[PDB]
Ligand SMILES: [NH3+]CCc1ccccc1
């Protein structure tokens with residue numbers, strides 16, 4: 001997260017860290033046995049880490065649970081990042097509590113200008129590299145679909161939206177991939193891609209979760 005702030009421990013209780021020996025992506029807890037992330041985060045050997053603040057220190061609220069199954073969206077296209085969403089089932093149910101909680105799925109899509117909370121353990125620099133140990137947060141509005149498409153001609157589909165600031169300085173970045181965009185209490189986006197981080201006229205692009213709610217709910221119920 002560039003241009004953001006320290007969330008404070010367990011203030012984002014649905015935020016998960018995906019770990020394969022190291023943090024590599026975020027995700028969101030949507031019920032006690034299922035996490036939503038980005039399809040471009042797919043890999044074998046995933047451990048889900050819930051209740052994290054400092055990912056390098058055991059602080060007392062963590063739950064580490066191996067993934068039993070990953071389900072990349074049937075139509076994921078890794079070239080274009082269309083349909084950049086993946087479900088991860090936990091080998092055992094998370095113990096839900098204050099510091100570990102699910103986030104609701106949308107009931108409908110969110111509107112341009114809606115303010116959202118984006119969070120992660122990604123790079124905090126727009127030039128260079130600095131990875132935080134504690135969770136970072138950013139408040140950012142959903143941008144109009146026309147400014148998004150103008151920013152990235154030929155690359156935005158109906159399954160994507162942009163959020164952030166056209167002036168730059170505030171954005172998601174490397175290592176934030178897969179994590180949540182929460183607006184009005186609902187998971188409306190997943191950190192997906194962009195052109196660099198926090199650059200002018202290059203806002204973050206996010207998977208548009210409201211298009212996937214029927215797939216998510218059907219998939220979970222059948223798995
Ligand atoms: N705003 C761009 C976020 C991002 C950065 C690098 C890889 C994936 C996603």
Ligand SMILES: [Ca+2]
Nearest residue numbers: 054057058059
């Ligand atoms: Ca920790």
